[PDB]
């Protein structure tokens, strides 16, 4: 009945992903964000099974929604003359990987590899559900700080997952790879590995190895932080020039680096309370 199954609390964000809000789904007080995007606003539209008319977001959302909860999963979603209305997981309490960096700083190496790790998980969700989500990056990752528990955020600027050339690109420049840059040419998997080198260096250096276009494309990493010699071989093969050379996502998991992770339970004990 109408949008009146939702309580709404305060606004948490707002930008090129619309306004998000906090709120309860009444029913059984399940925390919820409530997202408002303007048709006006939306650039990426797809269709339905059905046979109906939604942003690219809510088509590629229903795609990866399902048991496995690395990503935050789409409860249900409306449209109203103006705007659609989207209600995603909400964990609480919660945190963006990117006020974390900048909160606590370049992370231990065993705090980054759990993360890590997750996001990789994550992702491989995506793939397997036929989902390229194309702006990984901190600002799109959530920590439920209680479990340790990573979720990917924000897929619209994503793509349905295909193996032929992608020629259009709207996620974030400094996390884009080089071949975008010179060619605006890219292929999907190798890709989003450019952006997880990327994420990595964050991770471990607490900001993003590279500013320019010019930097991106010489693609020399240099480290600013103590970072062992294992997770900088990862990091400058996830950052490879050549896209061919980058690593597959088995590949990334089967490195020594990635070896022994943490659970995300041990990883909050540790590391968040
Ligand atoms: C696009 C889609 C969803 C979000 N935010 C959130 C979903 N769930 C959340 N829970 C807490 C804070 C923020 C969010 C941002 C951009």
Redesign the pocket.
């Known amino acids: 009945p109408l949008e009146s199954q939702y309580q709404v609390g305060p606004l948490?964000?707002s930008?090129g992903?619309?306004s998000?809000y906090?709120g309860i789904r009444v029913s059984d007080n399940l925390?919820?964000?409530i997202?408002h995007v303007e048709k006006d606003r939306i650039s990426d539209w797809g269709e339905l099974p059905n046979g109906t008319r939604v942003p690219m977001?809510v088509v590629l959302l229903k795609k990866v929604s399902s048991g496995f909860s690395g990503v935050?999963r789409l409860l249900d979603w409306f449209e109203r003359p103006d705007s659609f209305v989207?209600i995603?997981?909400?964990?609480?309490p919660?945190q963006?990987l990117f006020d974390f960096i900048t909160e606590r700083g370049a992370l231990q190496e065993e705090l980054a590899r759990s993360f890590f790790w997750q996001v990789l998980e994550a992702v491989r969700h995506c793939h397997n559900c036929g989902v390229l989500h194309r702006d990984i990056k901190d600002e799109?990752i959530?920590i439920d700080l209680n479990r340790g528990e990573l979720?990917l955020?924000?897929?619209?600027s994503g793509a349905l997952l295909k193996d032929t050339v992608y020629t259009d690109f709207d996620g974030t420049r400094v996390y884009s790879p080089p071949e975008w840059i010179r060619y605006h040419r890219y292929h999907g998997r190798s890709a989003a590995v450019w952006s997880l080198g990327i994420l990595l260096y964050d991770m471990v250096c607490g900001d993003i190895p590279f500013e320019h276009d010019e930097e991106i494309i010489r693609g020399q990493v240099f480290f600013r932080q103590r970072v062992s010699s294992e997770c900088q071989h990862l990091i400058r093969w996830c950052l490879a020039l050549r896209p061919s050379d980058r690593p597959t996502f088995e590949e990334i998991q089967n490195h020594p680096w990635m070896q022994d992770v943490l659970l995300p339970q041990e990883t909050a004990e540790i590391h968040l309370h």
């Open positions: 948490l964000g930008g992903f619309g998000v906090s925390p919820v964000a997202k977001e935050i989207l995603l997981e909400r964990p609480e919660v963006d799109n959530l979720k955020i924000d897929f619209g």
